[PDB]
């Protein structure tokens, strides 16, 4: 953009809503536990308050419904976290969102389908 008109901005400036956030990854994927990496885009001229992690069961498309399975209040200095309480030997999907004093910020994209481990003794 490029472009402004007459007036000044020098006392009390309400803040925006953050971006969606990119880099996402899977891996060091466990049984019921896994780390999903990520990237700050906009946080929004506010440092985020809250990041969302939901995921979906089984069917990763769209006509179901996205809810929250781990969430990391109090941290806006993690690059990445571990998404416990997951379901294992199921494929499940999950994604990221920025929370500030302003909202929350939309679903990003989903991460690509993965295998959770198996809960229990499964060795040699």
């Given amino acids: 953009g490029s472009s402004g008109s007459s007036g000044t901005i020098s006392s009390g400036v309400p803040p925006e809503l953050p971006g969606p956030p990119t880099n996402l990854g899977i891996s060091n994927i466990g049984p019921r536990s896994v780390t999903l990496q990520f990237r700050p885009g906009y946080d929004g001229k506010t440092s985020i308050s809250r990041w969302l992690v939901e995921a979906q ?16 209040s109090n941290e806006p200095d993690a690059r990445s976290m571990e998404v416990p309480d997951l379901n294992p030997f199921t494929c499940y999907s999950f994604r990221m969102r920025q929370v500030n004093i302003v909202g929350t910020s939309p679903p990003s994209q989903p991460s690509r389908k993965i295998q959770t481990l198996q809960s229990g003794p499964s060795s040699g």
């Avoid at 069961?57 to 990391?72: A, D, N, P, R, Y």
């Fill in 57 to 72: 069961v089984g069917v990763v498309g769209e006509g179901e419904e996205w809810l929250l399975i781990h969430q990391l």
